[PDB]
């Protein structure tokens, strides 16, 4: 058996927050949103561990970039362009980029430009536009009994939140909103908003990991927002055993929720929300008129339902698997 | 007075050709159409100059990239992708880019991310789609006088193309057709395919670039596929002094039709076809509440209808001469 074509997302790097905690001073070095420098290291470091495993490992890749043999598509934004061009910058590093006349360099250092294409802000296959993400999750998750109950839980905490923090804090989606930029002052070691204990800034975070996840355990919802992408990875392994295609991987740049509405369209979903650089990748292995598929997330592989001890089915297996759950939705 | 901003459009490097010529057993190194590795070395090349003439001579930009400072779009190609990855490689090169921690890079050699995105497929931006293209041609220039003229001119060499080089040659068209693969040829160091002499592909090469120019002579073809973009460079002008936009730059990776278009919608239409790497800044300048354009075009200032002996006009004076021709079409 032999691997023949992987299809992959990410989750772009560390970032900026994408709000400000009204009562904090935090300066991030960067524009809201945007990629930092540890966030281009992350996916550039996920690069190299993916040259080792698909270019040293499995030989499915050779060691200097084959025009075409890479289809990468990012969310429209930078965050995800830029994170896409840093494991790249892993994936095929300095030292294997081309040569023009006598072994000299076509670019400095012979980097390899490798084509990234983008969809438009308005497209919903890597993640939706905000507003209509969140009225999915109005209408299918707060007023969810889990949503309420863990509202319930947690709400004898919002009006302190409230107070310290400055930021509106009345339901778990605020919560998410201020947990954020705690993740981020965590990550760049940044201190505590004054009167925020660390009990409270765990408390809140633990809540943001949970809500984000628990979005995304109904499969009805993950397939609204996650059904497209998913059928088209799998078609993207049909077509390197169809013949449609030549590509070697397809490579998906994404969010937290690309990864979090993949997984749980295929009745996998997360039980913690994917941190900076998580990846997921669909690999395909022929031997033989014999094609077997599995499902990697964060260097572990999957057991989806349809898989045996070794996490592994037929591609026509996972044809019949993706095909069922079209028609439950 | 000080330059302020800057939008530019770059034609791609050397690339493959689209077609092939039947009677000739070219082999390119890269698939058709795609950017080779000295196409690569003439963006990067460019990308050095610019950081030569913006960053180092007029201080626009900073030495090190700051985050949201330029706006990169491209057409969805990979040759423009590709091109417009490359000259940023010339513009903030391997040791610019971020450190983390302790000076130690973000990325290896210190490499620049700078974030490229793309319109769809079916974007008339930057380019026309090919089939629209040639709707446009058909209806306006292949049945105009100066185009038949030049057909009567070289039709009695047709026969002889035709036999010589397998493809079809029944107008210029046809001459244009396979005169990019002859540009693509010579630029290779590749031998004339047989029987076809020296004198054939200089006449062929000729008519290519001929044909190609007399295309965008036409102010009104110009418009229907360039005054979009026209207008929108304009427009990136007018956001850097109405507060609307902070970037610096802004930067369309494009081809030889984009540069033919705006230039053919400004009045100022090119005699020649845009070579790789040719490129077009509108700069902008400010002393005090007085600003001021120039229109530069590979190397060398364009003298617009409405500018002076110094080739500069009021911003003021390009809205109106815009407007003008907004209006004509």
């Given at each position: 058996?032999?691997?023949?074509?992987?299809?992959?997302?990410?989750?772009?790097?560390?970032?900026?927050?994408?709000?400000?905690?009204?009562?904090?001073?935090?300066?991030?070095?960067?524009?809201?949103?945007?990629?930092?420098?540890?966030?281009?290291?992350?996916?550039?470091?996920?690069?190299?561990?993916?040259?080792?495993?698909?270019?040293?490992?499995?030989?499915?890749?050779?060691?200097?970039?084959?025009?075409?043999?890479?289809?990468?598509?990012?969310?429209?934004?930078?965050?995800?362009?830029?994170?896409?061009?840093?494991?790249?910058?892993?994936?095929?590093?300095?030292?294997?980029?081309?040569?023009?006349?006598?072994?000299?360099?076509?670019?400095?250092?012979?980097?390899?430009?490798?084509?990234?294409?983008?969809?438009?802000?308005?497209?919903?296959?890597?993640?939706?536009?905000?507003?209509?993400?969140?009225?999915?999750?109005?209408?299918?998750?707060?007023?969810?009994?889990?949503?309420?109950?863990?509202?319930?839980?947690?709400?004898?905490?919002?009006?302190?939140?409230?107070?310290?923090?400055?930021?509106?804090?009345?339901?778990?989606?605020?919560?998410?909103?201020?947990?954020?930029?705690?993740?981020?002052?965590?990550?760049?070691?940044?201190?505590?908003?004054?009167?925020?204990?660390?009990?409270?800034?765990?408390?809140?975070?633990?809540?943001?990991?949970?809500?984000?996840?628990?979005?995304?355990?109904?499969?009805?919802?993950?397939?609204?927002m996650g059904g497209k992408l998913t059928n088209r990875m799998i078609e993207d392994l049909n077509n390197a055993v169809n013949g449609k295609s030549k590509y070697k991987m397809t490579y998906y740049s994404g969010?937290?929720?690309?990864?979090?509405?993949?997984?749980?369209?295929?009745?996998?979903?997360?039980?913690?929300?994917?941190?900076?650089?998580?990846?997921?990748?669909?690999?395909?292995?022929?031997?033989?008129?014999?094609?077997?598929?599995?499902?990697?997330?964060?260097?572990?592989?999957?057991?989806?339902?349809?898989?045996?001890?070794?996490?592994?089915?037929?591609?026509?297996?996972?044809?019949?698997?993706?095909?069922?759950?079209?028609?439950?939705?």
């Open positions: 058996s032999k691997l023949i074509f992987v299809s992959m997302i990410t989750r772009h790097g560390d970032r900026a927050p994408f709000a400000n905690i009204e009562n904090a001073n935090y300066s991030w070095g960067t524009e809201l949103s945007e990629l930092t420098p540890i966030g281009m290291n992350q996916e550039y470091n996920l690069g190299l561990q993916l040259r080792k495993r698909y270019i040293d490992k499995f030989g499915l890749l050779p060691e200097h970039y084959v025009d075409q043999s890479i289809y990468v598509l990012s969310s429209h934004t930078n965050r995800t362009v830029v994170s896409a061009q840093s494991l790249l910058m892993g994936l095929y590093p300095a030292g294997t980029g081309p040569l023009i006349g006598d072994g000299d360099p076509a670019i400095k250092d012979r980097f390899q430009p490798i084509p990234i294409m983008t969809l438009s802000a308005d497209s919903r296959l890597i993640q939706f536009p905000y507003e209509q993400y969140l009225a999915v999750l109005k209408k299918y998750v707060y007023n969810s009994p889990e949503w309420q109950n863990k509202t319930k839980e947690a709400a004898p905490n919002f009006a302190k939140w409230q107070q310290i923090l400055g930021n509106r804090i009345s339901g778990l989606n605020d919560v998410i909103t201020v947990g954020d930029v705690l993740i981020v002052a965590q990550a760049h070691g940044k201190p505590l908003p004054k009167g925020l204990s660390q009990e409270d800034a765990d408390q809140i975070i633990a809540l943001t990991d949970w809500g984000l996840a628990q979005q995304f355990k109904s499969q009805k919802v993950s397939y609204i969010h937290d929720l690309t990864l979090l509405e993949v997984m749980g369209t295929l009745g996998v979903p997360l039980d913690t929300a994917p941190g900076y650089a998580s990846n997921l990748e669909m690999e395909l292995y022929k031997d033989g008129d014999i094609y077997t598929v599995k499902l990697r997330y964060n260097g572990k592989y999957v057991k989806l339902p349809i898989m045996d001890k070794n996490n592994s089915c037929s591609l026509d297996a996972l044809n019949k698997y993706m095909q069922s759950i079209n028609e439950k939705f």
